[PDB]
Write a structure and sequence with these properties.
It is classed as glycoprotein, immune system. This protein is mostly loops and 5 residues long. The chain has no helix or strand.
């Protein structure tokens, strides 16, 4: 998965 914020 990717990174949030």
């Amino acid at each position: 998965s990717t990174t949030a914020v």
